[PDB]
């Protein structure tokens, strides 16, 4: 995967077609000067832009996209449909025909809506997944065929989150789904390899959260951790390792001091805390882990 | 003061009678064999006992105490009414003659009572004072006068509290009081010199506390801070000190790296921080500052 925020907002790969299958090809930002966003906009490369044609997603739009026209008469811009660009624990777009409904356990509705207050709404009904629609639509349920009515491309789950517009939301008859886990506050893991994310996930994490999650996988001699994602914003924000038997704290990250890509812990046993502040708030953190035997 | 704890168990003065009027003289920690508390049962100096006959509080009891007699055949310890042993924020024992209550706010009962607990109540309902009476009575209020029917000795107030039986509850028509800022999670301070304590002190600070205060002296050149009490358990538990203009933390403290007796901030402006994590508890810390032009 290529992407580990909701709206690709981390894609960096090498998509500049509007589609692998019958697509448009993307214009370089480095001549995009009618547009709003190009490099001169932009230099020291904020959001990705560069001297290239490839999808980004600079102006917390719901999902990478391109200039497909130099002068904005008409259509202009698209978005991209990368298939690698799909966070973990987002389980696609699918269509939702009315009756019955993908997920079948229960829904509401709200003026707010956002990715997490669906899928925290759903986690504190005990279902394990989480469904938004229409932009305001929330349904929950553990029903394992959320797919009854087919995949549909993920584009057309792009209607903005009412709550929030740089998320997406679903669709007329569409509807996105996620794992119940994204964004929990704490969890165990015994998968061999997986994606742990901050808390309230992919909502921006919340002042004054203590979380831990335990990775425990019997038989591992080590867990290899990298950070495809890590937006924290102060010093005083925290993401800590800790050696599960001892409690000793292996390593501490915050706003001031970044992880590696990546590096190995020789323990089967791990927990991960994350720790926020009372004064700013940032996008967080996406951890894949993928233990060794 | 020399006591920055509910029942003093941080106390290492020298009284060695159980009143500095009238009381008795205790006996030696390195002679009371027949007891159960002496310096063959805490070698390594736990409680503070050693080869003196000062008053401690090695037992989790509500204050400080010390033997009387050698042989337990009646009354052979006594609790000590130290004056400099009362917490910063415990404004001291109090009778309450019944009509109207020295507190006129309000008040509960519980099985339950600490002296949080009951803190926690008032300030919740934003009144300044909490008093607890008989073990199991909180009472509140705003009323300047909670003294109307006099001091006690502060041992009258020494009921067990309902709900933790190392903390101090009033007793019969006796009302232990606090200032409700003590144990807040978070507040502002302003004065030249105070004290500001763990969440939920003196009760243990609970899991998944995130908390500040600020510090703030309009003039101030620098601010001394001391620790008289640091009781943090875990690594991963943290306490710390912010610059208040750019928000850089300036010291962190956690269970395994302890604050020096004291130290010097040049700001007149400081965040104190404090995050639990969600693995033991302990008793937590009290810190002093003192503001200097
Ligand atoms: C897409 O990008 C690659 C460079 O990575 C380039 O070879 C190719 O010409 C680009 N395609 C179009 C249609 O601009
Ligand atoms: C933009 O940069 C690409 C890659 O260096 C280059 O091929 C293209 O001609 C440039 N166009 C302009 C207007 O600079
Ligand atoms: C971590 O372990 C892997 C095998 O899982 C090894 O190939 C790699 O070199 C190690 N990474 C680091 C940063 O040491
Ligand atoms: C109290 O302690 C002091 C030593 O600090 C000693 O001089 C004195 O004799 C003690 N008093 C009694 C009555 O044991
Ligand atoms: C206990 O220690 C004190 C101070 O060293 C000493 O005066 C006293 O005689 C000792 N008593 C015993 C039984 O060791
Ligand atoms: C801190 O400041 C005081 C004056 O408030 C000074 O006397 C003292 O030496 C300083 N303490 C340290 C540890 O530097
Ligand atoms: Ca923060
Ligand atoms: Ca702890």
Redesign the interface.
Known sequence: PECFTANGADYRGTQNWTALQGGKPCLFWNETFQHPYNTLKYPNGEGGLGEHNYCRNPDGDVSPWCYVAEHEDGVYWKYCEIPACQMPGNLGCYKDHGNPPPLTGTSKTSNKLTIQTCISFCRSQRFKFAGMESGYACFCGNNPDYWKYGEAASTECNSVCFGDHTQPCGGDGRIILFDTLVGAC?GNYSAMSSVVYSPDFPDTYA????C?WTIRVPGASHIHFSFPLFDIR???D?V?L?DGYT???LARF?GRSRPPLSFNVSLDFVIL?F?????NQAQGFAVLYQAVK
Chains 1, 2 share one sequence.
């Not at 002042?207 to 203590?210: H, I, K, S, Y």
Request: aromatic content about 14%; cysteine-free.
């Open positions: 704490g002042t004054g959260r203590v831990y102060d010093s005083a925290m800590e800790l409690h000793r704290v915050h805390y720790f926020s502040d009372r004064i």
